Amino acid sequence: VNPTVFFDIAVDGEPLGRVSFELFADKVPKTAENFRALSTGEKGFGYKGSCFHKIIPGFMCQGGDFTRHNGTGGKSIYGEKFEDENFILKHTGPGILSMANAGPNTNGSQFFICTAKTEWLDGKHVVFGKVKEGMNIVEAMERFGSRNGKTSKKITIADCGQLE
């Protein structure tokens, strides 16, 4: 019953491929739900059209700032911010999907996809999903990043929604 959502990823507008994700609703219901809803855009805003504004090769690709596209924006579907649901799940390797934040209980809409084991984030970021299909696309994405996270082409979610 875990949901599956997808991003049609594009680079300066040119389709790269579809990545799909398993959201672990069975362990972090509220967090999975937030990402699911923002992927369908059913609440009237969401991820369609936003970019990955920070990609650091060999570390992670971060996105989800759909209000300001630069790491300052984003909102949850619950209000402005919500709490750390739990730290059951660990950053075990590439493909892990996890919440960006600015300290305890500051979950918005921003997230990142690990491109390695990043266990130093364990117990400080809530892990809630995993890539599933199209890890390779996220690897291709890694290559438009830089050591500081500035990206050298506009990597976008041209479309997104739920597959199941």
Short mmCIF file of N, CA, C and O in Angstrom, two decimals, residues 17 21 29 31 37 47 55 68 71 76 83 89-90 102 104 118 120 139 143 147 162-163:
data_model
loop_
_atom_site.label_atom_id
_atom_site.label_comp_id
_atom_site.label_asym_id
_atom_site.label_seq_id
_atom_site.Cartn_x
_atom_site.Cartn_y
_atom_site.Cartn_z
N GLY A 17 14.37 11.85 -18.11
CA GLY A 17 13.82 10.54 -17.78
C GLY A 17 12.88 10.70 -16.61
O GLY A 17 12.75 11.77 -16.00
N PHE A 21 9.60 7.03 -7.01
CA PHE A 21 9.99 6.92 -5.59
C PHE A 21 8.96 6.14 -4.79
O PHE A 21 7.75 6.35 -4.95
N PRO A 29 4.19 8.15 8.03
CA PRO A 29 2.93 8.49 7.39
C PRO A 29 2.85 9.95 7.09
O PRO A 29 2.49 10.37 5.99
N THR A 31 5.01 12.41 7.04
CA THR A 31 6.04 12.95 6.14
C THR A 31 5.82 12.43 4.72
O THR A 31 5.89 13.18 3.77
N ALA A 37 1.41 14.45 -1.44
CA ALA A 37 0.51 15.51 -1.89
C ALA A 37 1.19 16.59 -2.72
O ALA A 37 0.57 17.14 -3.63
N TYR A 47 5.28 20.54 -6.31
CA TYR A 47 6.60 20.42 -6.92
C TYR A 47 6.66 20.61 -8.47
O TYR A 47 7.72 20.97 -9.00
N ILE A 55 22.80 20.94 -6.09
CA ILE A 55 23.32 19.59 -6.34
C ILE A 55 24.82 19.47 -6.06
O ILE A 55 25.63 20.07 -6.74
N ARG A 68 10.34 29.76 -3.84
CA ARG A 68 11.46 30.71 -4.03
C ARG A 68 12.67 30.11 -4.75
O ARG A 68 13.61 30.83 -5.09
N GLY A 71 16.29 27.75 -1.89
CA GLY A 71 16.64 27.10 -0.65
C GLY A 71 16.03 27.83 0.51
O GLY A 71 16.10 27.36 1.65
N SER A 76 5.06 23.15 3.82
CA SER A 76 4.40 21.86 3.99
C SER A 76 2.92 22.00 3.68
O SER A 76 2.48 23.10 3.41
N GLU A 83 6.92 18.81 12.34
CA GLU A 83 7.87 18.29 13.26
C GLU A 83 8.54 17.02 12.71
O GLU A 83 8.04 16.36 11.80
N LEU A 89 14.05 5.43 10.09
CA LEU A 89 14.88 5.15 8.91
C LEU A 89 16.20 5.94 8.82
O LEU A 89 16.23 7.15 9.08
N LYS A 90 17.28 5.24 8.44
CA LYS A 90 18.63 5.80 8.37
C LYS A 90 19.07 6.11 6.91
O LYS A 90 18.48 5.63 5.95
N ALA A 102 16.15 23.14 8.93
CA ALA A 102 17.08 24.11 9.54
C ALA A 102 17.15 23.92 11.05
O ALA A 102 17.08 24.87 11.79
N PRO A 104 15.75 21.05 14.27
CA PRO A 104 14.64 20.27 14.81
C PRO A 104 13.28 20.86 14.48
O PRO A 104 13.10 22.06 14.67
N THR A 118 25.00 8.67 3.73
CA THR A 118 25.29 9.96 4.36
C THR A 118 24.91 9.88 5.80
O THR A 118 24.12 10.69 6.27
N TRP A 120 26.01 10.61 8.53
CA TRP A 120 26.22 11.67 9.46
C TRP A 120 24.95 12.49 9.58
O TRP A 120 24.81 13.28 10.50
N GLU A 139 21.92 10.16 -10.89
CA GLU A 139 23.36 10.24 -11.25
C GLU A 139 23.66 11.20 -12.38
O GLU A 139 24.64 11.94 -12.29
N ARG A 143 25.85 15.47 -12.26
CA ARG A 143 26.91 16.04 -13.06
C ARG A 143 26.68 17.48 -13.48
O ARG A 143 27.54 18.05 -14.11
N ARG A 147 30.90 21.69 -6.25
CA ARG A 147 31.28 21.44 -4.86
C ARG A 147 30.46 22.29 -3.88
O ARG A 147 30.22 21.87 -2.76
N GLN A 162 1.31 10.83 -8.76
CA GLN A 162 1.36 9.53 -8.14
C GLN A 162 1.15 8.40 -9.16
O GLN A 162 0.29 8.49 -10.01
N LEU A 163 1.92 7.34 -9.05
CA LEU A 163 1.69 6.19 -9.88
C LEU A 163 0.92 5.14 -9.12
O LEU A 163 0.29 4.29 -9.71
#
